[PDB]
Design a protein around this ligand. Structure first.
Ligand code: CA
Ligand code: CA
Ligand code: CA
Lengths: 330, 190, 183
């Protein structure tokens, strides 16, 4: 199969947006499952958010073509026409034009079967006062959280990007909000359900103190965008690609952050009251897996909310329902 | 949008609060129907003024004056004459003193049909009964002879004041409420 | 002029600003310190404005069922299930219907009838509203809630609405009666 000219991403020859546009009947006829849904909120004139930066990590060349998550953007078509010039080189993408708040678009898209729903907005950052600034994103979250998918609802996985951090309080219930808590301590951020640009401020100082650490995170979060690819994109030709030589295709063995479950398979022995240090050493030795944290249920008994524990102590007790973040090659 | 964010805020703080909100556009009602904890069965409600506005004038196309008939029942006003008013203005203004009230029918109404209960309210009590809450429970407007008054049936009345409709709760048949001037009904079937 | 008139076409106007009701009619005797509900165009059902709907908020608090009563009348029967279906964004779904759902086509409605001819016309010749009320309730299950009467009892076609008249109120053969009815 074809890759970008540096072999880092899966690639597709150009297309017209009408090759990937779908109505609700076409979208519903397609068996979308384990996909990514992007619920974009845009006016036709609103600024470009660069969805290429969302899609490109999902097309990293270290995935096999059969395991690439299909992606569907629900949003304004006139906006997506001017976005499209950047997106047209990625395989398995599709567009359902219309509002993400329509509870039909959501059902056609199989929102209950997706692996992640992304809620994102291109609207003006002070279209009005700071209470209105995220009302579409909040309504979209609450809408999805309320639906019923009787052949549910508040168990669709979701991540929303907030224009104004204090609006995180509206984003979840069973929560105990407090406006004097800063974003990183709130339950939606601790669960990975919310994100806001304010948490990225301290990257500036890390670029000063250790620039290599910023290249480490960029190679992880971009899925392998090298400075050569940034150079090629700066020539304005778009992302050039085709069939690739074995010598560049060698870079498809990139380390990635995956997540694994202690419920079944060889590590499940640690789920029955093992400790994180026993798991860490075992997995590093047997698999070259490097464990960096846990994703654990908040309700240890009810809700599906899970919270992230970065780098636990060696003696930290495991639960059979835990999931482990791992750096891995395969 | 601002009002929806306020209901979202109130419900986020505590889901069980009865919220009554005024909305200006009917398409905006869909947004708060989709909040996780909006529940009409518990009391939450949206007075959509575009829906109501166009509803009253639409029923006026079918009954040529209903929007005035009906919009006067939902504001409290008391009839207060002034001697310069013409006959039509005194007739009209007496009518504006009416509102719609809910009250429990007394046990003296039990096992009447709604038609007997309505004749009785109108002729003896000087109250216009127009509906009943049938026992979960459901509203019935002008139900036919098939529908009986059950014990503790709530009825909807048109009357000048809540002090009028109490008469239907205190009406005690041959037991006590025997006499023919309506001001006298005020005590039980002792 | 509709010569094969004119000021006798029935009309209802919705006002963005209530005090403009004064311009809406002539032969009227306007006064800016009168509130909308006392003006002749509103008393005749020719004008409407959103300001008369303000006090629905307090009725939703004091007796929510009364607000469902009026909504079932004014919408012609929009249930919360229909509001739910519309909130799915598919638009209003429909087709042929089963006899079991079609059973709901016998809804009570507010109609209007005339004392000029037919069985009630006996009350138009100097009967009283209480005689009419009892008769119609018993013979037809009609529940009379008010009158629509000509303002000029002699000229113009303007009629005004009388809500729930007294039992002894005198009828005119030109009156029309508001009725709750099933057929
Ligand atoms: Ca909250
Ligand atoms: Ca009154
Ligand atoms: Ca005038």
């Amino acid at each position: 199969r074809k890759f970008d000219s540096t072999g880092m991403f899966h690639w597709c020859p150009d297309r017209p947006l009408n090759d990937c546009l779908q109505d609700r009947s076409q979208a519903s006829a397609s068996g979308l499952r384990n996909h990514v849904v992007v619920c974009l909120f845009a006016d036709a004139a609103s600024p470009l958010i660069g969805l290429r930066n969302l899609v490109m990590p999902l097309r990293a060349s270290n995935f096999h073509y059969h395991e690439l998550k299909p992606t569907i953007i629900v949003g304004n078509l006139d906006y997506l026409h001017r976005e499209w010039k950047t997106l047209q080189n990625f395989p398995k993408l599709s567009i359902l034009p219309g509002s993400p708040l329509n509870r039909a678009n959501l059902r056609a898209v199989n929102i209950n079967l997706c692996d992640m729903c992304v809620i994102v907005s291109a609207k003006d950052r002070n279209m009005e006062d700071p209470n209105l600034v995220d009302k579409e994103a909040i309504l979209c979250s609450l809408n999805i959280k309320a639906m019923t998918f009787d052949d549910a609802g508040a168990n669709v996985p979701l991540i929303t990007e907030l224009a104004n951090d204090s609006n995180v309080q509206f984003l979840d219930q069973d929560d105990d909000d407090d406006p004097d808590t800063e974003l990183y301590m709130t339950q939606p951020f601790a669960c990975g359900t919310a994100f806001a640009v304010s948490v990225l401020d301290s990257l500036m100082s890390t670029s000063y103190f250790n620039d290599n650490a910023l290249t480490l995170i960029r190679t992880l979060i971009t899925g392998g965008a090298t400075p050569e690819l940034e150079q090629i994109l700066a020539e304005g030709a778009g992302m050039r690609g085709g069939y690739c030589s074995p010598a560049v295709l060698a870079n498809r063995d990139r380390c990635r952050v995956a997540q694994i479950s202690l419920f079944d398979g060889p590590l499940a022995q640690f789920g029955q009251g093992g400790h994180y240090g026993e798991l860490f050493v075992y997995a590093l030795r047997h698999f070259g897996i490097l464990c960096i944290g846990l994703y654990r249920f908040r309700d240890t008994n009810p809700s599906s909310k899970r919270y992230v524990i970065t780098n636990p102590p060696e003696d930290f007790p495991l639960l059979p329902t835990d999931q482990v973040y791992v750096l891995t090659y395969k | 949008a601002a009002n929806i964010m306020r209901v979202i805020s109130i419900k986020n703080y505590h889901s069980d609060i009865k919220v009554i909100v005024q909305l200006l556009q009917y398409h905006n009602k869909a947004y708060l129907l989709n909040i996780p904890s909006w529940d009409w069965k518990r009391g939450d409600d949206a007075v959509c003024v575009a829906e109501l506005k166009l509803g009253f004038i639409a029923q006026s196309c079918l009954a040529p004056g209903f929007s005035t008939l009906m919009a006067n029942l939902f504001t409290m006003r008391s009839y207060k004459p002034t001697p310069e008013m013409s006959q039509w203005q005194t007739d009209y203004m007496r009518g504006t003193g009416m509102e719609m009230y809910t009250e429990y029918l007394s046990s003296a109404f039990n096992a009447l049909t709604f038609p007997e209960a309505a004749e009785l309210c109108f002729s003896k009590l000087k109250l216009l009964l127009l509906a009943i809450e049938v026992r979960e429970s459901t509203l019935a407007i002008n139900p036919g002879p098939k529908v009986k008054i059950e014990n503790a049936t709530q009825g909807f009345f048109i009357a000048e004041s809540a002090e009028e409709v109490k008469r239907a709760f205190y009406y005690c048949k041959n037991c006590h409420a025997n006499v023919s001037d309506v001001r006298q009904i005020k005590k039980c079937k002792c």
